[PDB]
Design a protein around this ligand. Structure first.
Ligand code: JBU
Ligand code: JBU
Ligand code: CA
Ligand code: CA
Ligand code: ZN
Ligand code: ZN
Ligand code: ZN
Ligand code: ZN
Ligand code: ZN
Ligand code: ZN
Lengths: 253, 253, 253, 253, 253, 253
């Protein structure tokens, strides 16, 4: 067996990938989402009630389908990053990255020694298919994709420095955390917030990195795609489930 | 503590209750459904991957909300009925009921001896809140609601007989099983099927029982409500999740 | 490795075994109970929310401790009996046994062919420790203990016939189901019910079988032990947890 | 999406498929087995501690790999068969089938009405991918494969009658159950048993059905393959795990 | 829907709340505790085997009852605090708080930016009921209650400083950790320890904060209530389960 | 009850203990491993998908058998160490220890105050059997065994300083991590690496500490045992499961 190709990573330079947030925290729900045809699914370990074992179940469900899995850990925790890579998550989205130094540590956390600090345990890892991928320790690093979130003032204050870090494949803008940080909590649609988001997208792409974002607003999402934003999540399973059930009930009250 | 009042059961005689099918087989998904404001939630033990323990988790989730829980067991199995009643399911929907004799056995399965055959284990039961409901063994039978599905030719062949069974509170028409039984598998909307469903609804109400049905078709659901159908499910969580994610992706392909 | 000796089965003829009902349906709770020093623990698959997998977890927890595990299936279901024997339950308590014919089928359900109908799958079974007990298929039958519950009028109407069945090691009286069957639901303490229980215990022991019973009433439990009742459960974990927490709160209201 | 093609079913007529028993009852263990390259994996619901939910997890694990899943229910229970088909098991192995009448009921249990009695619930089923397989109710029956076990004297007494049942795709011989039934429990290797197995394989293939068998004995497995046996399981994960760990320890004692 | 009112938080100023420690780490056990009528339940993420997902199940169980849930995380970890707030824990008890700077960080960890560092993910959170609480991002901070444990010498060395932190609603004294820190491990009842606890309670109340404590000792608990201690836990479910089963067995040995 | 004697800890000074890596992350798989007769089983919380709750299940499985449990946390995290000790893990293997200061903190993390910083919660702990071990707070420290991994250049740069830390019972060499650190990733067999391992084992034993190592290579494992290495793991369950199933398939292709 050859290592699983990270098509999400390759497509960062060839197309615009449409994403779905997966926070139902469940193998069975993850599989329903996997049947739709999204370019990528974000398994949310930060804002959905997930742990390593529930993320593994969802990776196993999604693996039969073409949708590419991206995992968001709760934080940029080196040992948690090790755990998520070994269950075979090939793309990670690190929340609240605020310096070149933190971004550099996240790069190393995804690469084997001697160049990185990823803990070595290939005999035990779904990532290596328990060494059924015979050359995994040689081919692993190339199919790993690192995304970092800029979603705070300090993040924006260190944007040019983060964009200079080799091994950061993409910067993803978090409008909820960023609008809150800017004193517009719950109102990311405000012009003050949107002008910073557009400028930020433009700066990311000018430094040769992939830009990403989440908006459940169809107009905002289409605007980001027109700017050339490489990875755009367009909704959230929890939100779509709630809204679809409320919209149906309102037809009958 | 006084026994939980079965408002679903009381409302069978006073209003038309709007229902949502719950097949996501998950305590967390069940809570999302419970927040919407449906009159009733059908926790599907027949066609979703549920067991007693997953049904228990969903009852615990829904219990904090006004939505009334109805549980469908995989079949009219007396021991399984016993199990679902003790975890505190107060309304049961029995699939594929086909004679007065089977409906009578389902009535007895829901009532304590000496009048019924419900196994007695109140010290262990969430149903009694582990005897924190001090008179549960006296007050239980009153708050239990039995619904039976007519969804086969034999069922329609025994409809008058089933409708004469004291203890059957409601008959629910299953259009998927019934359309298939009639040789119109996948096409319940056909006039042949619909005329039999309308006639069946009319006969159920004429015998003083509650009539129920599921249709994801808004026009068919509104027609059944106009006929006075007492319990009408209008959608399915798995269906709404899939459709909502597909509809969103189609805006971006 | 030699097959696990069924000390519960042996002690039926040498002493009076004190039992604790286990309906918290949980490996961790089962282990707390296992630390107390009961002669036997009844893992309740009839009135607690248990399935094969949760009973297995509790068997694994209890196995490190001297307390002997007894499992009650939801019903006298031959395939469920097969499943519970293979995860390594060596003593079963069958509810609602009402004839010599049903008791004879329960005997066969616990024994390998050609004499019985227990399904053969020793390579897969914790019971054989996955064939690490090298002669399991030869030594299994001898360490299996069958108990049947008499707890209905029909049971009492067939008591002499059930007591004549070879391979029934014990008859256990269920006061909750029996008092309900006799039209004294919730009032097993009534003289009418108690005189039948005492006579029943006396008849069981006169036929050379072990008698068993559950009472949370200390006086009734001590009376049953004075009659020579071989296996007496004296409480229920759910009941003791609820009562201990209520009794503590009442000191502070 | 088109219905998942049952390659196991097709290959019954074109090749000899090498099988592995999966009794570790675990999504993660099922995936390790799926990486090896077995033609088919038997998820054992009869002699491993599995339920609908654990079988679902294992189907989800295995689905990303070419190995075809076969599921053995605990018995020929029509409602359990309905549950396993809806979670998306396309090939079932029914234990202890002993008459043409039982084999006919198993055929019907696997097919939609009006021809069969499979309960209809495509909107909820992983089988239909929640109706993302748009014509599932029309294409389902074709990709379902029914196997029945002959592993008792009464089975052998009804072999010709079972082999005349249209809809039985294969007969699988269970040497553990069959050797016990014949009074050679634990000794299937005996000439008395082996002559009956060989004759039975010959009869199965002469009636135009696929023959199958399990043997962990390499010599017996190769002999069965030389006779033309269509589906041959050659080992059991629990057995291989135990034996590999025992053999390694013995090198160091 | 309006945000869930934190009655625990309001009652810190109006009454003395009686608490029960919940360490059975189980949705079902948590519901049993919820039925008793305790003012508050401490779901222990520090000293019982809990994770985010097991704490979620226990919150869902307890939510149908008046008892207010308080969650103790394993440590004052900002990302874990974020996770427990989003699953909807409205009161946190932070162990081993030892400086004003740590207490200030715990205040910020519980509040949204720009004033705090709580991660924003309301679309995914049970806390917001998945935005069914429409103004959650405006009303959240008000219903969050922060408690900190003083249970070390350094904690006592920084008590005046911690008590001057705005946003700390309560200080909880941990007698096990504090007695151990003072060189009286296992003997909190010693006058040396008790004099420091009473003095500490008095200082907490003098600074206008709520004081709290756990003691399974009825006399010590009543003494702490007589001093005006605002939140007093009086027992532990694991302890009461073990003691109740031991006391019962001793009546029969 | 007296505290569970740590025989692994005692045998570090009296014999050479043969070990098996347990990375199947499963109570049921842990029990199969426990039946074989390994001196010690390493429950891998660093490179297998385990959390506190899955490690608890595996401790409960293994507890009925003589094999001694050793638990590897994902990192040297003081609060996680507290959690694993309270569920009753008596021997910990800390990964990637790189200084005397880190090794000292790990010693303190394993001992109660006042000498250590282990959080005190005996009433809730499987470790104390919920205080059924009456003197646990006095006898705990004695039966706890601390092992640290040297598996990086900085570890080797601090070997003499680590080996002078009182409370470090053993140093375990990780050849996967160490060979990667040395620029020989996937090739621990190289003379450059092996000479450093041998020298390292010699230094460990010369400082009076127990030396340990993992090798699936029988020749390397026997060489390490000939050098006097006190604890030698000789294989990995995931690796043995995969290899056994691959070797069997190859006989039939
Ligand atoms: O040798 C090492 O570094 C270890 O500590 C552990 C083990 O997980 C190996 O990585 C297996 O591949
Ligand atoms: O051979 C048989 O009878 C089988 O059907 C199955 C298998 O479970 C064996 O019993 C393994 O011991
Ligand atoms: Ca289950
Ligand atoms: Ca978990
Ligand atoms: Zn964010
Ligand atoms: Zn139906
Ligand atoms: Zn009973
Ligand atoms: Zn068989
Ligand atoms: Zn404490
Ligand atoms: Zn290592």
């Amino acid at each position: 067996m050859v290592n699983t190709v990270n098509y999400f990573k390759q497509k960062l330079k060839t197309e615009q990938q449409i994403g779905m947030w997966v926070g139902l925290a469940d193998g069975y729900c993850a599989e329903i989402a996997a049947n739709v045809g999204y370019d990528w699914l974000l398994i949310d370990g930060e804002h959905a009630p997930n742990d390593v074992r529930s993320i593994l179940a969802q990776l196993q469900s999604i693996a039969a389908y073409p949708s590419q899995a991206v995992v968001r850990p709760v934080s940029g925790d080196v040992p948690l990053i090790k755990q998520l890579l070994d269950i075979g998550a090939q793309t990670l989205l690190i929340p609240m990255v605020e310096s070149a130094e933190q971004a550099e540590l996240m790069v190393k956390a995804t690469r084997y020694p001697p160049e990185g600090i990823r803990g070595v345990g290939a005999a035990l890892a779904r990532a290596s298919r328990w060494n059924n991928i015979s050359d995994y320790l040689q081919t692993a690093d190339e199919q790993i994709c690192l995304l970092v979130q800029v979603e705070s003032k300090k993040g924006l204050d260190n944007l040019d420095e983060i964009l200079n870090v080799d091994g950061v494949d993409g910067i993803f803008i978090g409008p909820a955390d960023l609008s809150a940080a800017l004193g517009y909590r719950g109102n990311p649609g405000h012009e003050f917030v949107q002008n910073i988001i557009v400028q930020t997208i433009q700066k990311i792409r000018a430094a040769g990195k992939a830009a990403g974002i989440l908006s459940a607003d169809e107009k905002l999402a289409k605007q980001y795609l027109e700017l050339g934003t490489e990875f755009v999540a367009v909704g959230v399973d929890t939100s779509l489930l709630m809204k679809s059930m409320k919209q149906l009930l309102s037809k009958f009250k």
